[PDB]
Structure 1
Amino acid sequence: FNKDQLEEFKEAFELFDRVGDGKILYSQCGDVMRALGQNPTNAEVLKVLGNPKSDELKSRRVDFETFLPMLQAVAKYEDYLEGFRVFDGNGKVMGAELRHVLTTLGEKMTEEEVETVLAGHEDSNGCINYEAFLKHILS
């Protein structure tokens, strides 16, 4: 990463600094990494975080300089499509089934997050064009 990237990333990091000490929480580290173009899993985030314990994950704060190696470590389409084709073969996906699997398997998200991202993409039958939704969410 060059100086310009480090400056843009630090500025973004400081926007996430809610205490003024130049630091974010570990639980925000993943948010900053994804906002910066990475797509790590929560497991991957904890690994790059050093598998922190609950207490430091919830209250220990790290500055940009400590975050950066973690961003580096995280940094170092056809599968996404087949993954969606698992739940398909007319190119649609039920809204109920996607909601259930997103809220009950894997790294479970909230129902409100899923409703927010899914809002306006499903039709009256309850079908999602998943290729369009995928292109939309990858932009």
Structure 2
Amino acid sequence: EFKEAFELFDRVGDGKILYSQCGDVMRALGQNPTNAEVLKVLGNPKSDELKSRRVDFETFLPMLQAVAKDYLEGFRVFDKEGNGKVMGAELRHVLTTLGEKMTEEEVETVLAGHEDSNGCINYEAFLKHIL
């Protein structure tokens, strides 16, 4: 299963996916690391190496296992009343400006259809959808 994934991300033929693609692959296989957590295991390089160096599935397996060793409490922080809802506009703002910033498009993709007519998201059901 892990092999069928690694091969699909090689877009050249050298039996190797790019360094910047390593996070994308771990997430494809069901892991949820932060950008800094993947940048730890991959040497913490500069902008030169991220868009150049390449690694094989043999040298990539000890990274996938390294990352593989609640989420509801994250959402509950932006629930200002404790009432099971968060404002989608506040969630769009913080996801695009705080932490490991996401683009407008990425957030718009995951949030579309989950906002009610008062601008609220019922986050227990949203969390189960994104798991």
TM-score by length of structure 1 reads 0.89
Q: What's the CA shift for 1:39?
A: 0.9
Greater strand content: 2
For each residue in 1:62-118, what CA deviation from the matched residue of structure 2 results, as whole angstroms up to 9, or x when unmatched? Answer: 111111111111113xx2112111101221111110000000001000011100100
- TM-superposed CA distance for 1:20, in Å, is 1.1
Gaps of 5+ in 2: none
Q: Shift of the alpha carbon at 1:31? A: 0.8
Give the CA deviation at 1:119: 0.3
CA distance in 2, matches of 1:16, 1:121: 30
Match status 1:40 vs 2:33: yes
The structure whose residues are more often helix, as a share, is 1
Worse overlay, 34-43 or 112-121 = 34-43
Q: Between Structure 1 and Structure 2, how many residues are aligned?
A: 129
**Other-structure match for 1:19:** 12
Matched position secondary structure for 2:85: coil
The Cα shift of 1:38 comes to 1.2
Q: Percent identity at matched positions? A: 100
- TM-score normalised per structure 2: 0.94
Matches of 1:42 and 1:24, distance apart in 2: 17
**Root-mean-square deviation over aligned CA pairs:** 1.0
Q: Which moved more, 1:51-60 or 1:105-114?
A: 51-60
Q: Unpaired runs of 5+ in structure 1?
A: 1-7
Give the superposition deviation at 1:53.
2.3
| Runs of 4+ off more than 4 Å | none
